[PDB]
From a paper:
However, in the presence of sub-inhibitory concentrations of ERY, ribosomes translating the ErmBL leader peptide become stalled, leading to an alternative stem–loop structure in the mRNA that exposes the RBS and start codon of the ermB gene and thus allows ribosome binding and induction of ErmB expression. Previous studies demonstrated that polymerization of the ErmBL nascent chain halts because the ribosome is unable to catalyse peptide-bond formation between the 10 amino-acid-long ErmBL-tRNAAsp (codon 10) in the ribosomal P-site and Lys-tRNALys (codon 11) in the A-site9. Here we present cryo-EM structures of the ErmBL-SRC in the presence and absence of A-tRNA at 3.6-Å resolution, which were used as a basis to perform extensive molecular dynamics (MD) simulations. In conclusion, this study illustrates how ERY exerts a dual effect on the PTC to inhibit peptide-bond formation, namely, by (i) restricting the path of the ErmBL such that orientation of the P-tRNA is perturbed and (ii) stabilizing the A-site crevice to prevent movement of the A-tRNA towards the P-site.
In silico sorting of cryo-EM images yielded two major homogeneous subpopulations of ribosomes bearing P-tRNA and E-tRNAs, but differing in the presence (termed ErmBL-APE-SRC; 85,393 particles, 33%) or absence (termed ErmBL-PE-SRC; 75,839 particles, 30%) of A-tRNA. Both subpopulations could be refined to an average resolution of 3.6 Å (using a Fourier shell correlation (FSC) cutoff of 0.143; Supplementary Fig. 2), with local resolution calculations indicating that the ribosomal core reaches towards 3.1 Å. The ErmBL nascent chains of both ErmBL-SRCs were well resolved within the ribosomal tunnel, as indicated by local resolution. Moreover, the electron density for ErmBL in the ErmBL-PE-SRC was essentially identical to that in the ErmBL-APE-SRC, indicating that the presence of the A-tRNA does not significantly influence the conformation of the ErmBL nascent chain. With the exception of the side chain of Asn8 for which we observe no density, we are able to present a complete model for the ErmBL nascent chain residues Val3–Asp10. Specifically, ErmBL adopts a unique conformation that enables it to bypass the macrolide ERY bound within the tunnel without even contacting it. In the ErmBL-PE-SRC, there is no clear density for U2506. However, upon binding of Lys-tRNA to the A-site, as in the ErmBL-APE-SRC, U2506 adopts a well-defined conformation, which is similar to that observed in the accommodated state. In both the ErmBL-SRC structures, the density for U2585 is weaker than other PTC nucleotides, but appears to predominantly adopt an intermediate position between the accommodated and unaccommodated U2585 states, hinting that the Lys-tRNA is not fully accommodated as suggested previously.
Numbering used by the authors:
A (entry chain B5): -8 to 0
B (entry chain BC): 2 to 272
C (entry chain BT): 1 to 93
D (entry chain B2): 1 to 46
Write the structure that this text describes.
RNA sequence: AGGACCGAACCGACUAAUGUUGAAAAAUUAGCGGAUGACUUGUGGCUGGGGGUGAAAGGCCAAUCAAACCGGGAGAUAGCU
RNA sequence: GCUCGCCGGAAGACCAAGGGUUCCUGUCCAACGUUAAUCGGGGCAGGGUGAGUCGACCCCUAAGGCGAGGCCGAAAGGCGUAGUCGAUGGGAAACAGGUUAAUAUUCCUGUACUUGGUGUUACUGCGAAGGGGGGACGGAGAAGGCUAUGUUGGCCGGGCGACGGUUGUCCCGGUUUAAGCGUGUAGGCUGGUUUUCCAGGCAAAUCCGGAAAAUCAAGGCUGAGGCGUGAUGACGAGGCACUACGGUGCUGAAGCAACAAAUGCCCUGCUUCCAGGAAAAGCCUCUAAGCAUCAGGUAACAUCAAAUCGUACCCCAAACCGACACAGGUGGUCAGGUAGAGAAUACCAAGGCGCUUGAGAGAACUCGGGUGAAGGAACUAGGCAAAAUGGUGCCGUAACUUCGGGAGAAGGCACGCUGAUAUGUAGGUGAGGUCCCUCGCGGAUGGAGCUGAAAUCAGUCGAAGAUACCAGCUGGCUGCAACUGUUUAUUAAAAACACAGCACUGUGCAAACACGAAAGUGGACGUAUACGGUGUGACGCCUGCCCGGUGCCGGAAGGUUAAU
């Protein structure tokens, strides 16, 4: 599945 | 005689049908029918050379007698018929020998009319005779561009072409566009004008109305992306860029014409 | 047609089975394997001469060879064509 | 969910059959490479 | 009469729970939208990689797409770990 | 083996796709099965797929592919004519019963049918790659006439009830039969026959079409279904009999009527509406080049041939597609009883299953549910989730509006059972009797029988009668988009996209534009009331000003300027 998303802290 | 539709449910309120009661309902004169399969707007390469074309109801092509080669023989109308391919109505005239051919219908046409092609033919609407016999200023349609080629001019409904001049072998013609253009007098032409002048009145009235016409939805380029169309991006509609075709040719204010060979026939630009 | 030499190879081997015996003791239809090709007529004539008995009607079918396997290696058998030669009142052997 | 693989022998022979390989020189080169490599199955069928 | 109404098949996937090394690499359950049409679907073709297609999300093109996959140039380059 | 439980518009059955012996039997338990396993879709072995008329092959053609020459391109190659291939289409013909452990429209039994070869006889103008006809087609809607099928009655066979009754207005079961053939009805379509003439259908024409006459009014085509035949039978509940207790032989009663009735048939109809609805062959006819006592053509009989290939099993799944015996995905066909509007839903028939780990204990906690006293959003980012509303008939219903809406607005009443009206009414269906008939599958008269709601009155039971399943929450202000749709398959269904409409601009046809070095196509077998591009986004009121900068059009003297 791994997915994606992002890490905008 | 157009009749505005009553507002029963949305997509019906704005519809304006153009009924034509004198048309003969029923199956088409079968032998002259022939197949006309939809192209989808694609060519032999399979690329979409022309966008916004596809789908729609199937249509069957019908041969029409452009040349009107049967001079001298009297003709009589049998019945009017609808033509899916064209704005103008077609008509099934009966030649005295029993041969039948479709012809574009003049506004003055009615059932039983005695139209007759020929050089010696009397000047009444529905006749198809060479322009050399035609008096100046008479309404004219279905004009041949070449001697006996057919009659590509004024095929559309409500169109008419006045002949304002006859000097030389040529006769000058006034196109419906308003552009002037010389045409050889030897070319055949039909007197009067086609009667479907109500054709402009239709307004479709729904989003799905274009679907059977083979028309496909139009996506504006500003809503697209820079990679797909020169317009696009800008975060929130915007515009900025000078308007252009997707291939980059300048839209609005650029004559694409480049023939030169036919400039001699162009007496004047359209106004 | 005959051309005896072509017909002689048609009858390569009888195919005995428990069902075939019931076919013979009741339906009087002898059962045997035939050539991979051939036809309904040659199979008939082959019984008309060498079996010296009249044929009522001939039937044909092809039984696919069941696949076998041993380890990663596999081995299909071979296809063969069963035939049902119905005999008249003149049947013998 | 529907799988990407939706088998049909008729499309299969037409798309990847020996005749398709013979349809053009580029397909014949494929067979030439499969032969040079050595293979039990030059194509696929029955 | 209707891109008309309620509502199964059929199609679609708005909410919420469960699931999160699941029964399932996106489902199930309880509701939902459309359901004579711009409908859905079977079968068989067409458009081939800076190209295709797109009622336009830069989405999709065999579970991968701000440029598919396979092989080759190729042991590319890397002042970096 | 005896019971329970689930589906039953399927979790039953069938075909295609696809799989490829998983099918049947014997035997085996290492490995395969999320457990043991004598079992299995597992190992081994044997057996199993029977076609003139099911399908493919075959004839024909669509979108297309290929393509003699040809056109074009550095080469490879691309395009394309005549042609050829291409079904998801069209084109000749088998139905019932029986049988096997597994195959049956295939074998057997019974009754049949089509197209050709050959022969006999009779009559006679036969003959294309050509002409014409036919094949040959849309959406929606309206009924009517019927069948599949069901209920009830009658008939026949069987049963007097484990517990108070049950020889009667009782209970149970059966009441099944095709293609073919004869008959040509309910209907639908069209005025027929004959003579003469013609610039048409590339050649010709007796055919089609056109034009003049004459004559006559029913001439023909199409067509379900019914009724006969097929059928002295077949099937058949149930018995008589041997019995490897898994069955096999024989015999075998009644086999009708009435009503209801479809999504199936008549219907490729009819009516109606624009969006005006493939292609060719087989088929019916026409002659030409030709044969013309022939060959051929048509008809009755007889005979022969109908090959090759598929045929087992799975078919919404354990076997196809998902790495799995995986809660997913997979097209068409068959459509029982009761209630109901219904293919919804509940309970059942036929039939298939209890889903390949179980036995216990009855902690939290978690998941799936039921109920809860008092309060009723005090919870929370937020009425999220649950709860609630829910049917038919009738009363009645506002602001606003493009006068169609809003609207099922909102808000209420009635709803079970039984009797009477009427021992079953209004209606529907329809036999006998009677009469008329150019006499048929006729019509009128006549009304039995069957079927059958809805209403009123009265009575009656429960806390509750649309009692279960099934089955809208409603109103008010306002933002946005006109609306129906479409969109990030796999976190965003939206105000985003589309949209009809409006406007601008390009384009006179060998069009602009677009694919492609080209050739050739698309646009379009269209012709400015058309087409392309751009912007805007129904409708109503409208849409002001600025050409300095930027872009573009128009203008041709001068300034400037390339190759030469």
């Amino acid at each position: 599945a791994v997915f994606q998303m992002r890490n905008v802290d | 005689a157009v009749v505005k539709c009553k507002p029963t449910s949305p997509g019906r309120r704005h519809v304006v049908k153009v009924v034509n009661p004198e048309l003969h309902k029923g199956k088409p004169f079968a032998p002259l029918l022939e197949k006309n399969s939809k192209s989808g707007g694609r060519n032999n390469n399979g690329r979409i050379t022309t966008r916004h074309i596809g789908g729609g109801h199937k249509q069957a092509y019908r041969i029409v007698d452009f040349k009107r080669n049967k001079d001298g023989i009297p003709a009589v109308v049998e019945r009017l018929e609808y033509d899916p391919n064209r704005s103008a109505n077609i008509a099934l005239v009966l030649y005295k020998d029993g041969e039948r051919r479709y012809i574009l219908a003049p506004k003055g046409l009615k059932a039983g009319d005695q139209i007759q092609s020929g050089v010696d033919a009397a000047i009444k609407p529905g006749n198809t005779l060479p322009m050399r016999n035609i008096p100046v200023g008479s309404t004219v349609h279905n004009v041949e561009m070449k001697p006996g080629k057919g009659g590509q001019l004024a095929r559309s409904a409500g169109t008419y072409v006045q002949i304002v001049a006859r000097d030389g072998a040529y006769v000058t013609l006034r196109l419906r566009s308003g552009e002037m253009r010389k045409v050889e007098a030897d070319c055949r032409a039909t007197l009067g004008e086609v009667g479907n002048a109500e054709h402009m009145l239709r307004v479709l009235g729904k989003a799905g109305a274009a679907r059977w016409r083979g028309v496909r939805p139009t996506v504006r380029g500003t809503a697209m992306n820079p990679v797909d169309h020169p317009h696009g991006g800008g975060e929130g509609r915007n515009f900025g860029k000078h308007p252009v075709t997707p291939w980059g040719v300048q839209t609005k204010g650029k004559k694409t014409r480049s023939n030169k060979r036919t400039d001699k026939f162009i007496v004047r630009r359209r106004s | 047609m005959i051309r005896e030499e072509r017909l002689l190879k048609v009858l390569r081997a009888p195919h005995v089975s428990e069902k075939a015996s019931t076919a013979m003791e009741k339906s009087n239809t002898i059962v045997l394997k035939v050539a991979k090709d051939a036809t309904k007529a040659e199979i008939k004539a082959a019984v008309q001469k060498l079996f010296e008995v009249e044929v009522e009607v001939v039937n044909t079918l092809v039984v696919k060879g069941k696949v076998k396997r041993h380890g990663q290696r596999i081995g299909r058998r071979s296809d063969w064509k069963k035939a049902y030669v119905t005999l008249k009142e003149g049947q013998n052997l | 969910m529907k799988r990407t693989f939706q088998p049909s022998v008729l499309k299969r022979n037409r798309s990847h059959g020996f005749r398709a390989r013979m349809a053009t020189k580029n397909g014949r080169q494929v067979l030439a490479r499969r032969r040079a490599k050595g293979r039990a199955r030059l194509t696929v069928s029955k």
